[PDB]
Symmetry: C3
Subunit: 175 residues, 3 copies
């Protein structure tokens, strides 16, 4: 009867300093509340882009809070301080190249700079971790593209049961 807990991690020095409002994390939470039919809790965190803090935070959410899914936003570009993908790979046992490929494909429809994104996704135990973009609009387009495969992925790793509203996002399951 595993309970569904979804982690939302905003990685931004500015946001963590309070220099500006976290519209990215808000965009992710709003999206989840809007499309998920099944019951679920949220573990929200806003941290600066410190490599060690990112890894420690991902591990805490998966291991200690029992998250079945963790969505990050921020730190996925070419800049040297953007280490979210590095942190993600460092805490996962298996990576899923298909996520990064599709997210870049979808973004490319908007801007050619989509090829500069290093967003990825991987598995840590019964938890799926996915790197999302920063802009609320791009976050929506991104989730509409990958969410259809997320619930089933979590099923396959032993995570909590999640289902979405087919009228908004169809969670494909080989039935």
């Amino acid at each position: 009867e595993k309970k569904a807990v979804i982690g939302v991690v905003t990685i931004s020095d500015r946001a963590s300093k309070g220099i500006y409002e976290d519209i990215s994390g808000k965009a992710i939470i709003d999206y989840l509340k809007d499309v998920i039919i099944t019951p679920f809790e949220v573990e929200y965190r806003v941290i600066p882009d410190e490599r060690d803090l990112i890894e420690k935070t991902l591990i805490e959410l998966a291991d200690e809070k029992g998250c079945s899914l963790i969505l990050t936003t921020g730190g996925t570009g070419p800049a040297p301080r953007d280490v979210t993908p590095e942190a993600t790979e460092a805490v996962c046992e298996k990576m899923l190249p298909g996520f990064g490929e599709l997210m870049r494909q979808v973004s490319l429809k908007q801007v050619p700079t989509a090829i500069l994104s290093r967003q990825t996704a991987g598995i840590r135990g019964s938890c799926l971790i996915v790197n999302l973009p920063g802009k609320p609009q791009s976050i929506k387009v991104c989730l509409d593209a990958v969410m259809p495969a997320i619930p089933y992925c979590i099923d396959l790793i032993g995570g909590a049961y999640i289902d979405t509203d087919p009228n908004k996002v169809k969670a494909f399951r080989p039935k």
Copy 2:
């Protein structure tokens, strides 16, 4: 001129028990016999989801049976026991990112969960190894997508000569 030997490996803890016939393996064999017009033999193996055994099987086929191409099916998903990609990476000295990229791309057209596939391809000596999915529909779109480049790839690594029926799938080759 090396003799053309093609390995077909079905990876499943179930199929290695006789729990059912091997539809996936048969689909691959039938495809090969249907499109290839040059002389070739098939080395068929059905093994469990054990990384070490998969590694040893691929090495046996490449090194001892002299396979120039090895096609695997099964164990490419997110589940922890799906270790075919890891075993493939372990025995190859050079990976080809283009294969997993295109295969997931064509598979995604009907299967949203295609982004959960960790299929890849690599080279071990003069043998090309390619990970295929388990479902027939996916196996077909994947082979139709990559086969046009397989014979030529084999030429470049010094493997045996293989050609296909252009009315089914044309194998590229320079003048």
Copy 3:
């Protein structure tokens, strides 16, 4: 950026380096650069045999000593064992950019079925972006038209020199306030 823009063009070809073939690939890249860039820049041109150590040494020299902000290589990206340009590139970079190889193979497949045999990639070493291009002059332009729009901005982000392109030829996208 007050940085002086220096672009490296490295041809990795045993035959080109020995004087067997004319390097139409390197020439194609240089002509493309001069054709679309609307800002001042110098070119560090090198032609070398496909020796992994030399490839790594050359990339490192152009980035660390010549101060290149961009290095475009041509050759050695296929499945044959001697093609080790991607390996050398990953060896000298600290951060890879999967989107480059992905897009380049995607736009190439529309014309070359064996595009999936290409192992071209791109990565970052300090404030220098390194991108692997194909050998055929025709394929070089196709790959560049696809990825060049993202190159100047990527260089901005890593602290490299300022480069801009003629919007009528290639539009270098950059976010504006």
